[PDB]
Symmetry: C2
Subunit: 309 residues, 2 copies
């Protein structure tokens, strides 16, 4: 028995889990590591001999794309009852973890009670607190672009533009990664920036002091970012692949996601870091959107068009 996984998630995240699954089950697992976008391309040129069994994606959007193309199998209630939220409308993939957009800040240099209630108001807050040149962002980062796509869905292009241009007027510093940006907050180069919650979790665990601000309920700045996995219609190993999806939603694998990776789990029965907002409170702060249908290409166009990207 064998299993082939196309993974848009990183090898450092996936490998330890695949190894334990192999050790436990006797099933040989082969993984192809790529980006979600590149996997979507590969899936549309697949042979019939040894096709992939599973698509494990970094984003709901990529799985929604695979689903829209009719490449994914329906999943059953036995599996889909496990995650507490974010089960797709299509019901053709299972959400595995969630990552929350947040506002990171240095708590010694920035006062928690003064931070704005909406991401849209960040430029005004910065402007009025004297922080021109002291705001970071990550324009080339996947989740940042997802967040902008969220803003387009919720607010339309003009409020999003005014936001993008008002941010640009702040002379913000762009970082090639989130750890780079959080290191710059530590350094004193910038005081705050929009990021994913788990980067803050990782910095705190290393002993660094970072604040984690959430915007008002439903704000675009709180976008929930879901990872997930789907069974390919041409899987020749249906039982083994379903077994692997079940494994990803198991208490121990979910503790690995919370623990080794820092992401939010989607099952109960798992222990969170102290000072980390509990899972269901975190979910309540995110806007209600179809994560399978975020206007990502419009966001990218709008970012490329405005010279932020």
């Amino acid at each position: 028995p064998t299993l082939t996984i196309y993974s848009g998630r990183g090898q450092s995240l996936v490998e330890p889990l695949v190894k334990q699954f192999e050790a436990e089950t006797g099933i040989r697992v082969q993984v192809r590591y790529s980006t979600d976008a590149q996997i979507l391309a590969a899936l549309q040129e697949e042979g019939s001999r040894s096709p992939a069994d599973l698509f494990w994606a970094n984003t709901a959007g990529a799985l929604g794309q695979a689903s829209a193309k009719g490449l994914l199998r329906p999943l059953g209630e036995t599996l889909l009852e496990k995650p507490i939220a974010f089960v797709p409308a299509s019901r053709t993939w299972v959400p595995v973890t969630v990552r929350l957009r947040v506002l990171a800040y240095n708590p010694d240099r920035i006062k928690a009670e003064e931070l704005p209630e909406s991401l849209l108001d960040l430029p005004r807050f910065a402007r009025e607190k004297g922080l021109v040149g002291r705001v970071g962002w990550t324009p080339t980062y996947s989740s940042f672009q997802d967040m902008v796509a969220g803003m387009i869905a919720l607010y339309g292009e003009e409020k999003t533009r005014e936001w993008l241009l008002a941010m640009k007027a702040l002379a913000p510093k762009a970082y090639p990664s989130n750890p780079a940006m959080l290191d710059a907050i530590r350094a004193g180069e910038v005081d705050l920036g929009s990021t994913n919650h788990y980067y803050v979790v990782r910095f705190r665990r290393a002993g660094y002091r970072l604040g984690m601000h959430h915007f008002r309920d439903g704000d675009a700045g709180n976008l929930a970012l879901v990872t997930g996995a789907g069974l390919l219609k041409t899987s020749k190993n249906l039982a083994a692949a379903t077994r692997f999806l079940t494994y990803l939603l198991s208490p121990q694998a979910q503790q690995y996601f919370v623990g080794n990776i820092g992401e939010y789990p989607l099952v109960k029965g798992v222990a969170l870091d102290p000072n980390l907002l509990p899972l269901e409170e975190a979910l309540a702060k995110s806007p209600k959107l179809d994560l399978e249908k975020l206007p990502l290409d419009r966001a990218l166009r709008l970012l490329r068009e405005t010279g932020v990207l």
Copy 2:
């Protein structure tokens, strides 16, 4: 109700206790103190003690509690779970292990040039022109355990020699391991002896940091074992045994590896890929009797030499 006297920190313990209560209904009360203060408290309290479990930061403290007749023997069911470190007395269970290691700036120091033995660190440091650019943590529990391991392996005279040679490197003392690793990041120091999980945490945050293991059996690879024991006085044996069973469960063991960064002691726990596998890590540690570590001798030595 279940009452735990914990030598482990609240940051580490709280999430596990919260989950155990939610799943069992058992109300858990934890007293947070140091291993040393818990040992004193348990004796002072005698048969009056409300303590069901002693969850220790160090195997040495469980050794003392056992030698002093405080602990109940445990069942084979529990003691067959850990892969290593189960006491002969069978009166407590190991839960995690941490390894002493040498952290270093991998841009300034070449992995292949590092010394095979902790005893040779002063020679290496002086050869590489690192006077005033070595860090250490003289007030930290695991550093003191490491010095105690050196007395056990090499004797007091060789350990005294090392301590004085270390002092002549004009090392920078840090009150915490994160502060030392931040100094390595800053370029203030180039290397320092630490616990493996501190390096794991820094790496997970995106920082590059080298992690050196010494030759098999070296004092610089000391295994630092945590564990828990059931107190003879306990009137809540069922809940206490349920809790120990939980600590050795795969999900709890994944918490230790993931949330905390420590090595697990049960099979089937997924570690970060760049971390030396469990059994390989254990193989490099000196094979000392955990309950015999001469910590008092080490503290006296550190005080005489003016390190403390």
